[PDB]
Amino acid sequence: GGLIYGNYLHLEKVLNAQELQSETKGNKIHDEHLFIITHQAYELWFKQILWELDSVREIFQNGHVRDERNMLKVVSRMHRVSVILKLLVQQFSILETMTALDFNDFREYLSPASGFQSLQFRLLENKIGVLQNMRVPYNRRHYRDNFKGEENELLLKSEQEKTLLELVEAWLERTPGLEPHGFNFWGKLEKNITRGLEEEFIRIQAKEESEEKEEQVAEFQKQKEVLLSLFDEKRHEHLLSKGERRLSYRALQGALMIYFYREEPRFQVPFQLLTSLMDIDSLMTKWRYNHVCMVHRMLGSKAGTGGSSGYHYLRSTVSDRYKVFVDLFNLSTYLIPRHWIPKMNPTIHKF
Amino acid sequence: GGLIYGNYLHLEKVLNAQELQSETKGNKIHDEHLFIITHQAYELWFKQILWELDSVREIFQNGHVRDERNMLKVVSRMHRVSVILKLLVQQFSILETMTALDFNDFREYLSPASGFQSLQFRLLENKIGVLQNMRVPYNHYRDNFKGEENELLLKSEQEKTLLELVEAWLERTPGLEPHGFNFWGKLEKNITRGLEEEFIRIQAKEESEEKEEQVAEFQKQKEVLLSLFDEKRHEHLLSKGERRLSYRALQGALMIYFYREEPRFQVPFQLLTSLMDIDSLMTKWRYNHVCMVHRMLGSKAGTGGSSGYHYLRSTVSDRYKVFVDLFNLSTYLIPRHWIPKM
Amino acid sequence: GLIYGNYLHLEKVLNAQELQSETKGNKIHDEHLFIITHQAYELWFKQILWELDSVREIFQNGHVRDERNMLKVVSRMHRVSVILKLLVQQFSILETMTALDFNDFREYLSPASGFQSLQFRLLENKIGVLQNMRVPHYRDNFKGEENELLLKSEQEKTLLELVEAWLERTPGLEPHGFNFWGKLEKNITRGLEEVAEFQKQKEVLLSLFDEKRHEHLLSKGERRLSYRALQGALMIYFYREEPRFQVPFQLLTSLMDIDSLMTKWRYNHVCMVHRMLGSKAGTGGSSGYHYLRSTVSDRYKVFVDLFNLSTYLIPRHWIPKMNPTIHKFLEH
Amino acid sequence: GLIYGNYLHLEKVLNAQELQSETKGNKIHDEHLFIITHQAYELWFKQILWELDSVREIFQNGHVRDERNMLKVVSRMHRVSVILKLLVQQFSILETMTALDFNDFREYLSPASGFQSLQFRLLENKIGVLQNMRVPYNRRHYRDNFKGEENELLLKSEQEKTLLELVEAWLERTPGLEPHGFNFWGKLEKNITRGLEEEFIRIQAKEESEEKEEQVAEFQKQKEVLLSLFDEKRHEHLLSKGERRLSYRALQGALMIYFYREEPRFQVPFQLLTSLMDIDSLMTKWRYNHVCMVHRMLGSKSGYHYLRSTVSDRYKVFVDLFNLSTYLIPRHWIPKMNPTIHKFLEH
Ligand code: HEM
Ligand code: HEM
Ligand code: HEM
Ligand code: HEM
Ligand SMILES: O=C1C[C@@H](c2c[nH]c3ccc(F)cc23)C(=O)N1
Ligand SMILES: O=C1C[C@@H](c2c[nH]c3ccc(F)cc23)C(=O)N1
Ligand SMILES: O=C1C[C@@H](c2c[nH]c3ccc(F)cc23)C(=O)N1
Ligand SMILES: O=C1C[C@@H](c2c[nH]c3ccc(F)cc23)C(=O)N1
Ligand SMILES: O=C1C[C@@H](c2c[nH]c3ccc(F)cc23)C(=O)N1
Ligand SMILES: O=C1C[C@@H](c2c[nH]c3ccc(F)cc23)C(=O)N1
Numbered sequence A: 001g002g003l004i005y006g007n008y009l010h011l012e013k014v015l016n017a018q019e020l021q022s023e024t025k026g027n028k029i030h031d032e033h034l035f036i037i038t039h040q041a042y043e044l045w046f047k048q049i050l051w052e053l054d055s056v057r058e059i060f061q062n063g064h065v066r067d068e069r070n071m072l073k074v075v076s077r078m079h080r081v082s083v084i085l086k087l088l089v090q091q092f093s094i095l096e097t098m099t100a101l102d103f104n105d106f107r108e109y110l111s112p113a114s115g116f117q118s119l120q121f122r123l124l125e126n127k128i129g130v131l132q133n134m135r136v137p138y139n140r141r142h143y144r145d146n147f148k149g150e151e152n153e154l155l156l157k158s159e160q161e162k163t164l165l166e167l168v169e170a171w172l173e174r175t176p177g178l179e180p181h182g183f184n185f186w187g188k189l190e191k192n193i194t195r196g197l198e199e200e201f202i203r204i205q206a207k208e209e210s211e212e213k214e215e216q217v218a219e220f221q222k223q224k225e226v227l228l229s230l231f232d233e234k235r236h237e238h239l240l241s242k243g244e245r246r247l248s249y250r251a252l253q254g255a256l257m258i259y260f261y262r263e264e265p266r267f268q269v270p271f272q273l274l275t276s277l278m279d280i281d282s283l284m285t286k287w288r289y290n291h292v293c294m295v296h297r298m299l300g301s302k303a304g305t306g307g308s309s310g311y312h313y314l315r316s317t318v319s320d321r322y323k324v325f326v327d328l329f330n331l332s333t334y335l336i337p338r339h340w341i342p343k344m345n346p347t348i349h350k351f
Numbered sequence B: 001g002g003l004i005y006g007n008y009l010h011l012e013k014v015l016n017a018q019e020l021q022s023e024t025k026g027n028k029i030h031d032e033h034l035f036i037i038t039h040q041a042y043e044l045w046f047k048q049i050l051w052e053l054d055s056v057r058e059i060f061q062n063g064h065v066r067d068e069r070n071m072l073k074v075v076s077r078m079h080r081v082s083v084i085l086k087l088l089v090q091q092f093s094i095l096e097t098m099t100a101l102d103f104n105d106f107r108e109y110l111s112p113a114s115g116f117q118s119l120q121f122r123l124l125e126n127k128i129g130v131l132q133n134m135r136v137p138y139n140h141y142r143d144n145f146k147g148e149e150n151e152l153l154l155k156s157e158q159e160k161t162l163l164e165l166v167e168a169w170l171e172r173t174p175g176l177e178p179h180g181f182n183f184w185g186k187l188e189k190n191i192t193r194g195l196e197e198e199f200i201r202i203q204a205k206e207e208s209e210e211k212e213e214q215v216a217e218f219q220k221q222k223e224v225l226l227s228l229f230d231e232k233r234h235e236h237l238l239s240k241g242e243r244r245l246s247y248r249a250l251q252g253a254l255m256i257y258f259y260r261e262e263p264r265f266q267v268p269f270q271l272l273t274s275l276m277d278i279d280s281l282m283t284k285w286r287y288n289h290v291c292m293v294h295r296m297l298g299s300k301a302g303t304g305g306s307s308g309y310h311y312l313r314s315t316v317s318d319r320y321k322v323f324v325d326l327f328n329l330s331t332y333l334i335p336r337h338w339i340p341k342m
Numbered sequence C: 001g002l003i004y005g006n007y008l009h010l011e012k013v014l015n016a017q018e019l020q021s022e023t024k025g026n027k028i029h030d031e032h033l034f035i036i037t038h039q040a041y042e043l044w045f046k047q048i049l050w051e052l053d054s055v056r057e058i059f060q061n062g063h064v065r066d067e068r069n070m071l072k073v074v075s076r077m078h079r080v081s082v083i084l085k086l087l088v089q090q091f092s093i094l095e096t097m098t099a100l101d102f103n104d105f106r107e108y109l110s111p112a113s114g115f116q117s118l119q120f121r122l123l124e125n126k127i128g129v130l131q132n133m134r135v136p137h138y139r140d141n142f143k144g145e146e147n148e149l150l151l152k153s154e155q156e157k158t159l160l161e162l163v164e165a166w167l168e169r170t171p172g173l174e175p176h177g178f179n180f181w182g183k184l185e186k187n188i189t190r191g192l193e194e195v196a197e198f199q200k201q202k203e204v205l206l207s208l209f210d211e212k213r214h215e216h217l218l219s220k221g222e223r224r225l226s227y228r229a230l231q232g233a234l235m236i237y238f239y240r241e242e243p244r245f246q247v248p249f250q251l252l253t254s255l256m257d258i259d260s261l262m263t264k265w266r267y268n269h270v271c272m273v274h275r276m277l278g279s280k281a282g283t284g285g286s287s288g289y290h291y292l293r294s295t296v297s298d299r300y301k302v303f304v305d306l307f308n309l310s311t312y313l314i315p316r317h318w319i320p321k322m323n324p325t326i327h328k329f330l331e332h
Numbered sequence D: 001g002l003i004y005g006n007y008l009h010l011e012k013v014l015n016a017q018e019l020q021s022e023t024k025g026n027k028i029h030d031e032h033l034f035i036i037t038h039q040a041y042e043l044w045f046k047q048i049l050w051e052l053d054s055v056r057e058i059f060q061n062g063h064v065r066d067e068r069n070m071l072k073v074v075s076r077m078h079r080v081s082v083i084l085k086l087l088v089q090q091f092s093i094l095e096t097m098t099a100l101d102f103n104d105f106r107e108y109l110s111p112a113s114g115f116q117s118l119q120f121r122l123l124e125n126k127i128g129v130l131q132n133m134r135v136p137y138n139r140r141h142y143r144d145n146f147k148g149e150e151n152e153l154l155l156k157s158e159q160e161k162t163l164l165e166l167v168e169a170w171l172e173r174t175p176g177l178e179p180h181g182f183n184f185w186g187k188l189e190k191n192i193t194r195g196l197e198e199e200f201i202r203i204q205a206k207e208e209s210e211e212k213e214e215q216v217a218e219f220q221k222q223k224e225v226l227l228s229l230f231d232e233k234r235h236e237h238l239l240s241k242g243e244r245r246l247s248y249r250a251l252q253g254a255l256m257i258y259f260y261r262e263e264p265r266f267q268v269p270f271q272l273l274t275s276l277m278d279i280d281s282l283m284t285k286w287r288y289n290h291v292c293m294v295h296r297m298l299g300s301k302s303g304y305h306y307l308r309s310t311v312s313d314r315y316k317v318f319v320d321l322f323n324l325s326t327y328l329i330p331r332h333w334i335p336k337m338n339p340t341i342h343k344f345l346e347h
């Protein structure tokens, strides 16, 4: 038998998977078909994100990431995950063609099932690196309870196996130029920022004791506290513990090296990767936020079939507490004028 | 005990349908998984579009459309189809993150299967109203099918298309009755008069090569607007497949255009706009498919037999535009003052 | 003969790009993108004001009472939605600028900011955002003729108010007519008989008829519509298929759409500002990021009532049966 | 203090809206949408020219030789394709104007058209649309509709080095092409010759079947196309026919970057070639969405027949980059890299 489209794509499974509970309980509602197909498409795309994501995790875990041939493939697959999520954010607009009233006519046949029971959404959160600590109080206790057997087993492995956060952290820690014996990035930077701020305090104190200056002297003192707190490793470990940061002090230094020196040939694709990790975080959140806006129109204030407050619980998930790579965002707090960036000498350029 | 998300959605089926031919032949190629999911996603949405479309056909076929209570349901479902198609056009962006080089690594394992074997794509084309005899020469499309599937295509070819059902509904548009509002006779009279006057204002002007441009413009207009009232011409053009709608449906469509602000016509106007939307997005679908296949194959021939790129280009024409007549009513728009007063 | 460039006054549009970075002697390439992005946002804000004002004027001059105008109204409201969808997508362009590169010309913007966009505020005011519900005055940014326009835009009737009046005159609320409200209270009460969530579900439904609770929540600002407007809204939801209700229901749908898309614009702005500045202060004085997060809330959802009515949805067999008489009144 | 409105010069941008219907005493509401839409497009064409000129410059002044500039080049080419995506999306706004409403102000616009957009022509020229290959309108050149300085600026844009010419030059210096070096081309012919021979043996070994009759017709087709690629004389011929645009040597660089894209020196260059095809594809979707809208607005009123001509490979400047997918070969035929050339493609 020569290969046929329908058989290749196992459409005898995919297109024989649509059972309107409304029809099964004798009262067919038209739009329930849309409800099912929308979720099934979301779930196809989750599996494909998981396929890309597990493949990039494997390239870090098995050391292939160490060979820089593999960086185009890493960035290309991670960018693919953001392109898919973009589509998933847009996909909400299809289900927004269902009125709250028409939803109401079949809602009742759904209890107590809910999106909460999405295994693959949880595999996706975990594998990226959402920690138990990060999860909203209701979310934390209640998320893994919905599961049993092999489904319970996959969820554990997703919590226990190396997350994309951990693997990126290890890789960032080996960023070339951090070696105190070599380029000594962190040392040179602390020196240049200290030198840099001293020049700034002198520029400001040289002005005629006015109120435009008084604005500058106190804006300086805030900027100085902040820039110098970069070098306070104990503040890092303290912020690590309140989970306001997630990355090792040294990964942070790696990420900042990649940012400042991103044009150097060996950092070009590494910079692209860091941008794609922020994009995935931004789009995961835009997904959460587009989900909230739609549930508001569908339920108003009413409790969800899963037994949550509904619209309010979901609103609490749209928070930086769920941004895994929140640190890559927060590095923008520590941007300095280009003039203060430790200059590169011919030795480390060729490197 | 109680309904579980996974069970409701039959994810035991949906998420166990992903078999890489490259893996089955012991040379697993990563990007093959994307190829499969992308098509599985397209096919879920094709099934939803058929669901909405068949529901709208039945509302015309069983006379429920006669009861104007049901027009919000009709327009909202036809709008929903165009919203889904917007997503399917955007959806090519995902598959375009596969390089041609990466595609080249699993392409051999697909032979001789292809999109020509999409039952649902063909069912959708037929149910809207793509005729067997208007398909570009190389498409003979149904030979790619056998068995139960092949029967369904013929039910789809012989059962009443959206085009036929909208034609019948257009033929009953209120205002067309020669003893009533007599739209057609009044429109002919007002265009004939409006033109006569328009020509008087040209023979005022001082003979020049500017006045000759007006006379030349006027003669082109006159011929086009007056040809609207040539029924023998419409029947000739129907038979050549340059028009699809009966002469009387065309009159009903023009009535809906001119008088759209009249409450009874507001939603019917939204319906005609949606039908044109759906043709526009189908053709955007064919064009985005074409643009991607060019990057993937070049001028190489398809696994499904055809020349690939060049053949698919040919499917991006008004040959495949079911509601072409609704686009071409723009050709016969006239100044407001000429529209018969209500 | 008319020429494209002159029709479009391109001599102004394409001579409006001045890089402040270039003016102070070190041109930064990416500033040109920052300028053009803001200019296109402002062109589109103007087009939304033009649509919105024309719909305001169609309620205020009485024409909305002529139902042949409903197509124009829902079509112009729909158009504002399509423009807002593009304005949300348009952040994707400015996100091709890295924080690093932004950082190179940001110094020259001090102290200008979005807070000084007149059109954004006119738009917020004209839809019906109340200044007493804003997270902190915004007018302190504005002076001269701009402070005037802005003042007019709070005092002149908002889209919410005009939509309110219109919802208040909705066919079927008349107590000695179809008496929608009385029959609904009869019908919710007659159905509420049958781990039971029923006790919670009965408590919330029946508080719909508590005209007093509404009065309190309204003055407080957690609700925005008159009690009677909210009756009209719910009338149009339940009887949306009735010929006369179809395009009015499309209008309510598109009003919620505009709230969603404003909030989506607010949230996309936030996501981009987060990558651009981090937890830095904004050039206009505020703790940029955390303040912009506060604008993404129901304080700023003008038509929150139309959203919240999903709470009070009932099975259809409870909805007051519509007799052959009022079926006749709601035909064309 | 700098003020938002002054910074953006809004005193120009938001005082550039003159409805011609209104300045002839019959104001039509939708004419405003028409004007804003075009003005948004023109703002964005100006951004695309800003990006595209900086990139041409980077090539022209020899800075692109310094590979630390590749992140900037590929960022600005990707940005152009991101802008062009929104411009394609932008047509949906104008599609909310009905043909009936458009018809109320159409008369006031004569004889102006999109044909008169200076920036759209510069954009076409600077990317590298050849005037010799453009479909004529009314049997005449596209520069007829422009005079004075605008006519002069279009002429410069035809004569100055196009993005195509500057990519072509850089494609010609692709490392690995040196006959005395890695000798990519010679090695490729050798590996393709062997590949086809090895393939012809496994087929002639199969039983005389439907497959055997078929695979010999297909194999003989694939054979003609692949050996086609080494025919430098055919290529020079197709250059002049305009059916190909890049020099034979540039073609070689492009194919080298495809096959060895994972090589670090080749990662970002492959991303650039991917972006060039992206821009061609999005310019053509621009042309097609414009057409689909004009069909609805005008019908057969013949502009709509010229516009369907522009949706053609005449206007696809990097058509060669697409067509290379014709000459793709199994992974294992690609000439291997050794530690003398592998180490020359390490950053
Ligand atoms: C009318 C449509 C929808 C409604 C009313 C809705 C409602 C809800 C509600 C109320 C919750 C909170 C848990 C609960 O009370 O049950 C929830 C969570 C969730 N929904 Fe939806 N939903 C809708 C559509 C979708 C769609 C299309 C998806 C696609 C996969 C989805 C995926 C999820 C997921 C994964 C969660 C768990 C979120 C988390 O804990 O962070 N929902 N939904
Ligand atoms: C990504 C690489 C893809 C390639 C290389 C490709 C190639 C082709 C080719 C060559 C044909 C013409 C028949 C033949 O000679 O085989 C075709 C037709 C078709 N393809 Fe694709 N395709 C791709 C993706 C897709 C996707 C994602 C869909 C989604 C449904 C799709 C649906 C179809 C359909 C329905 C047809 C029949 C088109 C018609 O006759 O009008 N293809 N494709
Ligand atoms: C890199 C890009 C951008 C950054 C970093 C940025 C940053 C900020 C910040 C920090 C604020 C808070 C006020 C302040 O401190 O000045 C703000 C407010 C604002 N921005 Fe932006 N912005 C950006 C782009 C845009 C664009 C493209 C628009 C388009 C109109 C815009 C419109 C606004 C408006 C209207 C406000 C006031 C809005 C409100 O009060 O909710 N911004 N922006
Ligand atoms: C109602 C909307 C539109 C109509 C009816 C329309 C119609 C046309 C027509 C008929 C032509 C061919 C020249 C002629 O015969 O006058 C044309 C060309 C053109 N239009 Fe449009 N157009 C529309 C919107 C737009 C928009 C929004 C743009 C944005 C810049 C635009 C840009 C162009 C350009 C650049 C050309 C020349 C294209 C080429 O030569 O390949 N048009 N248009
Ligand atoms: O090739 C390498 C060097 C090292 C590495 C870790 N992080 C990095 C970040 C940027 C960079 F350029 C190199 C590295 C690694 O393990 N693989
Ligand atoms: O009001 C509701 C409905 C339910 C829900 C959302 N998405 C789903 C998908 C499948 C399913 F079975 C149920 C649901 C939920 O979470 N609250
Ligand atoms: O209600 C109706 C009347 C009639 C009809 C046919 N075409 C129409 C077009 C517009 C309109 F308002 C009504 C009609 C029909 O069969 N159903
Ligand atoms: O060159 C090709 C590849 C093939 C193809 C496209 N889409 C598919 C989907 C399923 C399948 F099995 C094969 C295909 C086709 O039609 N021409
Ligand atoms: O002719 C009319 C009817 C009335 C009206 C007010 N609100 C409504 C809401 C729905 C509806 F169908 C009609 C109305 C109005 O102001 N003029
Ligand atoms: O950090 C910043 C930069 C500034 C800003 C945003 N958009 C603008 C537009 C024009 C302008 F001049 C300045 C701005 C702001 O609000 N916070």
Ligand SMILES: O=C1C[C@@H](c2c[nH]c3ccc(F)cc23)C(=O)N1
Binding pocket: D064, D065, D066, D067, D170, D171, D172, D173, D174, D175, D257, D265, D266, D269
């Ligand atoms: O660094 C270099 C090498 C050379 C070059 C030309 N084309 C290329 C294409 C890819 C590549 F990696 C390098 C090159 C150049 O002009 N400067």
Ligand SMILES: O=C1C[C@@H](c2c[nH]c3ccc(F)cc23)C(=O)N1
Binding pocket: C003, C004, C007, D038, D106, D109, D112, D113, D114, D115, D303
């Ligand atoms: O019916 C028309 C109008 C004109 C056109 C298209 N875009 C424009 C923009 C500005 C302008 F003034 C005129 C036009 C054209 O080509 N055919």
